[PDB]
């Protein structure tokens, strides 16, 4: 639900690195669990044990990505003394991409992942700052 989003957002940007890291880890774990459920449903690989192994691998990868992003972004915002700045999120995003690239053990995904993730996190920070809506309400 939006409960995890509220727990992550209620923390101030430049404080409580541990809390932000924990919330990002929880969000990543939830996303990995959902992706694992879909993958298990659409592709039953060989058995129960292989399925639980795949679920655990996906969940750990997603949680690690979220944790690295949250920790790096919060640390950058704290030490740069410039909160509300999208470069911290970009830095966090790039780190997350790198974490994923290291997990998959290939440089192209890591390099590709770092650039794209950095862009997405910076865009999300810009949207928070400027008030961009992804799901707009029917105003007119």
């Amino acid at each position: 639900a939006k409960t995890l989003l509220h727990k992550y957002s209620d923390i101030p940007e430049g404080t409580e690195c541990h809390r932000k890291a924990y919330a990002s880890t929880s969000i990543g774990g939830a996303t990995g669990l959902i992706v694992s459920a879909y993958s298990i449903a659409l592709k039953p690989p060989a058995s129960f044990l292989e399925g639980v192994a795949r679920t655990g691998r996906y969940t750990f990868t997603s949680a690690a990505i979220g944790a690295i992003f949250g920790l790096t972004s919060c640390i950058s915002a704290q030490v740069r003394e410039k909160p509300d700045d999208p470069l911290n999120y970009f830095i966090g995003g790039c780190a997350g991409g790198l974490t994923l690239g290291a997990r998959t053990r290939s440089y192209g995904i890591g390099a590709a992942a770092c650039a794209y993730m950095g862009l997405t996190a910076a865009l999300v920070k810009m949207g928070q700052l400027e008030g961009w809506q992804v799901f707009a309400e029917p105003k007119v």
Binding site: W132, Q133, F135, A136, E137, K139
Partner: protein, 347 residues
């Protein structure tokens, strides 16, 4: 089957749809859906073979599950308010159930899986009927209860439908599956604008129905169901291939063709509600549909594929049955952009 029985079944399908469209009681809408489903099964199975039977059972299971959840949503709505009229939904759980049931009836993602298989299994006439007429009733019901839809769920399913249609069409060499994925993407475009303006939904539905009718009739005229079979048409009737190429360009949303009118209008409407990111992603994703339309155009009319010797005999014969309204469908699906402001007729 007997022509009298076939005519009666077609009239029963249309009468079920019209009963859904004209009634103000939830039970009568459910009855209309039931009548439509009952009369639809023989039409799919008209040419008896294992593929048609399999498609019919898949379609039956999907539609029966959807109708069961629709009845459940109606009963929950009645429980929380002693109302039978189709209006505001009065309950969030009932409205979520109703939205999911109508989404599976329409084939929106993630309930899209049955559409390609059912379309591939059935013939081209049954596919024409299934992809054009079978969308009117669920979309009309969605239009009537648009003010109660949760926009998040509707927009999520619409964007998912656009993405899934675009990605699934890239992998297809069968023409019926290409049509099915195109239909899924167009359904996503139609439902992404329901929360803001139902007139835009109806306009998109009309344009899509015209284009789909034209393309299906062109495919029936040149009796082809695969890419390679369609690549032989230029050696018998190049006019058909040229018309199909222009229709495919229109279906890709390229201006100044007719298929540009819906997306344009929808984008405008969404921008009026401070929605910017979603229309941008929607156009970016429609680029995929345009790509596989262009691949079909490459294989069909823009280049000349090898032919066979026995084609020479086919040169000596003419089509015995000519489909009326095909020229009108082609013209309406290609050249109606200058008449865009006519949409105020609340089409």
């Amino acid at each position: 089957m007997n022509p009298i029985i076939y005519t009666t079944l077609i009239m029963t399908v249309m009468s079920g749809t019209m009963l859904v469209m004209i009634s103000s009681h939830w039970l009568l809408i459910w009855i209309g859906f039931e009548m439509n489903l009952l009369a639809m099964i023989p039409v799919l199975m008209k040419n008896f073979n294992p593929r048609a039977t399999e498609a019919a059972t898949k379609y039956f299971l999907t539609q029966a599950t959807a109708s069961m959840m629709l009845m459940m949503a109606i009963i929950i709505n009645l429980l929380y308010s002693g109302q039978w009229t189709i209006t505001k939904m009065f309950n969030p759980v009932a409205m979520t159930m109703m939205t999911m049931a109508l989404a599976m009836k329409l084939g929106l993602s993630p309930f899209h899986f049955w559409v390609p298989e059912v379309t591939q299994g059935i013939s081209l006439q049954a596919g024409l009927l299934l992809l054009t007429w079978q969308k009117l009733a669920p979309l009309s019901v969605l239009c009537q209860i648009s003010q109660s839809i949760n926009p998040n769920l509707m927009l999520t399913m619409a964007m998912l439908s656009i993405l899934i249609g675009g990605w699934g069409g890239l992998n297809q060499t069968q023409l019926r599956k290409i049509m099915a994925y195109s239909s899924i993407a167009h359904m996503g475009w139609m439902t992404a604008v329901l929360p803001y303006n139902t007139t835009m939904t109806i306009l998109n539905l009309l344009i899509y129905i015209t284009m789909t009718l034209a393309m299906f009739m062109l495919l029936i005229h040149s009796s082809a169901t695969t890419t390679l079979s369609l690549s032989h048409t230029w050696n018998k009737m190049p006019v058909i291939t040229s018309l199909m190429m222009v229709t495919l360009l229109s279906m890709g949303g390229l201006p100044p063709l007719s298929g540009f009118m819906p997306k344009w209008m929808i984008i405008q409407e969404m921008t009026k509600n401070e929605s910017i990111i979603m229309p941008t992603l929607m156009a970016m994703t429609a680029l995929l549909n345009l790509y596989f339309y262009m691949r079909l155009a490459y294989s069909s009319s823009l280049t000349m594929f090898p032919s066979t010797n026995n084609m020479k005999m086919k040169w000596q014969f003419e089509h015995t049955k000519q489909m009326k309204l095909l020229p009108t469908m082609i013209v309406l699906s290609t050249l109606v952009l200058p008449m865009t402001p006519a949409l105020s007729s609340l089409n």
